[PDB]
Symmetry: none
Subunit: 54 residues, 6 copies
């Protein structure tokens, strides 16, 4: 196909996700849960129920 | 004016990263390393290329 | 790699809208003024002090 | 109160408006109205 | 989007605070927090609920 | 005649919380606050000292 869907990630969110991967105060599964939350917000940007949205 | 950088991610890569967070046969740490590799791939300039004559 | 967005404050946008309705300027004059405003949005000021550490 | 409202416009949208200003087959009034419609779509999309 | 404006006087005060070694780190942090809360409050004049 | 600097709401909220997070020593909290203040004064594409990217 000549066609593909794209999503936008701001630089602050990309950098935040990179930092989350090695935050040592969180278990690895807690890090994955925060990463998944960010990826879902990228996929549906109007979601305003995130842990950082409070 | 003020000006903000953004990155574009294709849907296949976004969905792959979503899937990777819950792949049961990779440990959480392995999933995070695969996540990190995808995120660095997006961050790192794709093409601005090695000239070799500095070595 | 990156792509970029420009951030227009509401007053800047409203100024451009007001220019479009000034009837004693010809339409071409109003276009030229809006062009000049659009060109200024695309240019950065970046007049920050260069601090490399602190 | 210390907070400000901003609109985000991608570079391709900005450059499209710049190019409308020199479409010489449209009258100046037509170009101005097309640019106004794009500006209003930024303000209330 | 929603941005806040920080005046240079406030930004320079917060940078200077970080350097005052005769104050403890917690005192410096609390002084910076006060300035940041002053910038933030209220985030919306019509929704001043950070003010009770 | 005064210079103003823009900060997004999320970063401002994060700096407020960073000032007290218990997972960082007080000196670490002050270092991370300083790195944020440095990027308001002199933007760097959101570079911070602890970053490995």
């Amino acid at each position: 196909s000549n066609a593909m869907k794209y999503f936008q990630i701001d630089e602050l969110t990309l950098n935040a996700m990179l930092r989350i991967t090695t935050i040592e105060s969180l278990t690895p599964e807690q890090r994955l849960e925060l990463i998944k939350a960010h990826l879902l917000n990228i996929k549906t940007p109007s979601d305003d129920n995130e842990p950082w949205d409070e």
